[PDB]
Amino acid sequence: VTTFVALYDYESRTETDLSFKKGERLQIVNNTEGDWWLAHSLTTGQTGYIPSNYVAPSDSIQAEEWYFGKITRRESERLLLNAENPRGTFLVRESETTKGAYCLSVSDFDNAKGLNVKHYKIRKLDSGGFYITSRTQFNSLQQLVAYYSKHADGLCHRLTTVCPTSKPQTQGLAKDAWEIPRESLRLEVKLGQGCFGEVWMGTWNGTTRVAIKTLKPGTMSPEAFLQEAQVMKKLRHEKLVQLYAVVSEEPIYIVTEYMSKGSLLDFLKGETGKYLRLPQLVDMAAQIASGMAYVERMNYVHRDLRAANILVGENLVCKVADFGLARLIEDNEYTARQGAKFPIKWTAPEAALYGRFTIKSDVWSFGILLTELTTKGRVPYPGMVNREVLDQVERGYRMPCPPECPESLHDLMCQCWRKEPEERPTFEYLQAFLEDYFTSTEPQYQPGENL
């Protein structure tokens, strides 16, 4: 039995889970896998299931709060660049580029370029210790961090603050929680109404903050939704809003990961969206494409990909919400791709005309989503009423480049809007294109050369 250590506080939610405080030592049977692990507290003698992402093996590198594992350069920068972080906020991660090396990523401020993140490659060969510059070497990553927390000694700045992070979501609300009683949910704040129900911020079991989506009775068969929710449950990706639980009797409640900043559409139209620079909007597009690239790999279909169905969290994290749900709506008009409730302006013609919804009609919708992104949420097809959209699009009309949108992104939109589904790009390509859209000016890693 290896001893694990608690990375964060965890407050009990059920009767069979084990609550514990950060740093508490827990016994887990060695090669355990899964999202919830049976644990015995070495400090309180209490026992129960724990979320496995809340622990790391004692005196492992994973147990250091500044060790962030396989996080990407882009996602480390997102966390480091938060405005509340002082200069010298830092994390350590694996190098995506040199097997066996690490990277020290540090927030910094330069009088010409402003707030920026510097990355230092940490190397370790048998002929020595861990090092950024060969003149100064250490027995451990822990020693390297402690040394540079006292002197920049060649670094842009002294290490000061471990990069802060929110307590991670657990995967599921509890072991074996899925179909839950309505009473376990407390709806607190109504975030809005959609055509077919409402979105709430709430609490499960008095402990856990969740989003709750409620569907008007008559919207969809509870049995059909349960069968589909089995599939959606299995879609797990950092850029997809996780599906936690369901109340399966009408009115159906859908319990999901809470996203603190609301829908992308409102975000873009609101006060924070006023000031977004193009690199920020492109990074948001890249995150959406990454979630849809996962959906594409899993041979799934979203069916209603637009800014209203993207949710925003801290540091402009964007995630795709409500994937696959629109297939189940039992309204005859909407199912015919007609009526006030159907988003014809985001809908590929083969989907509207023939009901052929595929990953490639999601690519089309993504193209339209990009216009919302670059116009601060303006409705697509500025002059047109919904009634005329499909006839114009079928005749080959496409939106011209929005005035605020660069020509290169409009070229991308036009690819998404090719008449033939199999001529449109993949989400794999869309993600890659958007991630490499801007050619950076700085070198990837600071020249450790000599510091």
User: Which residues are known catalytic residues?
Assistant: 304
CA distance 70 to 242: 20
**CB crowding 10-30: b at 16 or more within 10 Å, else e:** bebbbeebbbbeeebbbebee
Q: Report which DSSP code applies to 18.
A: -
Whether the CB-CB separation of 412 and 430 falls below 8 Å is answered with yes
The size of the chain, in residues, is: 451
CA distance 381 to 109: 42
Beta bridge pairs of residue 390: none
- Give whole-number Cα distances, 142 to 58, 61, 67, in Å: 14, 8, 10
Return the closest-CA partner of residue 85 out of 280, 259, 239, 315.
Answer: 315
CA distance 388 to 210: 40
Tokens of 109: 């401020």
Whether the CB-CB separation of 209 and 201 falls below 8 Å is answered with yes
Q: Element (H or E) spanning 49, and its range? A: strand 47-51
CB neighbourhood size of 105 (10 A): 23
Q: Report which DSSP code applies to 67.
A: B
Q: Which residues are annotated as a binding site for ATP?
A: 191-199, 213
CA distance 434 to 441: 17
CA distance 161 to 16: 36
β-strand pairing of 89-94 with 102-110: antiparallel
Tokens of 443: 């070198």
Q: Which amino acid makes up residue 221?
A: S
CA distance 96 to 117: 16
